[PDB]
Design a protein around this ligand. Structure first.
Ligand SMILES: [Zn+2]
Ligand SMILES: [Zn+2]
Ligand SMILES: [Zn+2]
Ligand SMILES: [Zn+2]
Lengths: 146, 57, 75, 57, 77, 146
């Protein structure tokens, strides 16, 4: 795992992605901090969001554990910051990288998945009243992410 | 332009060794060290119905 | 001439008109990379590109950079 | 030394085009232009049961 | 041990680690795992002479750095 | 065929084997002359043998025509210089190069295959009296290959 993580890290330095940053905190290559900018044209625009990333000792044959540390209003992300995303469990591919995982995450922010959401009350709102959902999502962004 | 070549032959799972093993039917490759655990192609998700060791000389 | 960053980070150069849809593009990516269009999720900025819209509808300019990732799902 | 990698991927029949087609079972590769004219593998002589297009990705 | 070179059919030169007491069959097996050519398709030549399966490198007086040639099995006629 | 033949010729310039040389006679890239050194500690030792090579226009999907110019004593080569070698006919492979073909022929010299001889009388001598066969081979080398 260590070589593969170093390679990803080297690639990140060689081609930094826009809106996303990730890398080790300390000397521990297996625990990373990451940030994501709120995508433009969504309720999270202008917000900054922090995540923690823990790589398993058999990475990349198992997915990294990824979680938000910033409060965010979204059907797939609960108050422990856990994310409901298939590529992080069953649909993980060993060819995925943190760069791509973070991007998948941004993608989820703009377009929530209606199937089997983590925070049903939010999904319920998103399903019925969108003005409500968007409003609260922005307020949450204004409050916690800026 | 040599980076185009050395990175075209690099296994995209481990990001380290050169590819050797071809997945059929999809046709994607991985290195021999990464291949055995893989039932689905890491690149396209195609089921791997068989894998073939290649010799590129 | 546009640019696509594949699942593995290889940058492919495409050739298309703004007229070409997001579905049309996935086929060229398939032709080039051997990846079924249903396993393809393409991203402009931080947002997904759906099947019906166009390269012009998302405001993709000359030599604009797109990102391919794997199909996603789940809540 | 880019030449070296360049030679690696060169079809060993035409000595010209890059290899894209793998023969199975044997795993030897040729370019798409040479493939259709080969019943047997030119490298090891093994019969060619099928021909798979390879993709580097 | 010691190392020898084999110029493979396609022309690439590969390096092998060998014992001078290794049989020709031994070497054809190493070639097979490297190049994917079964031993019965291999004809190994050194100093213009074919190397026979049941013999060793020492019998042909093959030394460090020797370059062996690989061609396809052929039938005399 | 022409490109293939040019690429072959280059690889000869670059990495020729030890016992053979070959190349276009004229400006005609499809007609070559070759040289093979007689293998040492064999009856053909000290010998230099010339051959003629003609590439078909569909080379390399069809074998080249190869024949000895220099007279030689051997059960696989007749007085017309014709060589009985399966790789020159039905065992041909399009990956074989003239370089490999000449090396192949050279290995016949010290390893005549008595099975299906082109010149049965010569094989008969090789089978019964090997002392004799060597003498005649050496003598022939002496007249013709010097
Ligand atoms: Zn690998
Ligand atoms: Zn695949
Ligand atoms: Zn070819
Ligand atoms: Zn083969």
């Amino acid at each position: 795992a260590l070589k593969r993580i170093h390679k990803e890290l080297n690639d990140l330095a060689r081609d930094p992605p826009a809106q996303c940053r990730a890398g080790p905190v300390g000397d521990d290559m297996f625990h990373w901090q990451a940030t994501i900018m709120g995508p433009n044209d969504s309720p999270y625009q202008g917000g900054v969001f922090f995540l923690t990333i823990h790589f398993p000792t058999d990475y990349p044959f198992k997915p990294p554990k990824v979680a938000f540390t910033t409060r965010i209003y979204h059907p797939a992300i609960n108050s422990n910051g856990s994310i409901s995303l298939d590529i992080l469990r069953s649909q993980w591919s060993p060819a995925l990288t943190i760069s791509k995982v973070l991007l998948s995450i941004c993608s989820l922010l703009c377009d929530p998945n209606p199937d089997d959401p983590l925070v049903p009350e939010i999904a319920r709102i998103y399903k019925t009243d969108r003005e409500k959902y968007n409003r609260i999502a922005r307020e949450w962004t204004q409050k916690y992410a800026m | 332009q040599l980076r185009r070549l050395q990175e075209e032959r690099t296994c995209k799972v481990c990001l380290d060794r050169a590819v050797s093993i071809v997945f059929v039917p999809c046709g994607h490759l991985v290195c021999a060290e990464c291949a055995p655990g893989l039932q689905l192609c890491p690149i396209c998700r195609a089921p791997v119905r068989s894998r073939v060791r290649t010799f590129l000389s | 001439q546009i640019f696509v960053k594949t699942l593995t980070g290889k940058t492919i150069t495409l050739e298309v008109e703004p007229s070409d849809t997001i579905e049309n593009v996935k086929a060229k990516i398939q032709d080039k990379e051997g990846i079924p269009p249903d396993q393809q999720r393409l991203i402009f900025a931080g947002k997904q590109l759906e099947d019906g819209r166009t390269l012009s509808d998302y405001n993709i300019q000359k030599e604009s950079t797109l990102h391919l990732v794997l199909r996603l799902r789940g809540g």
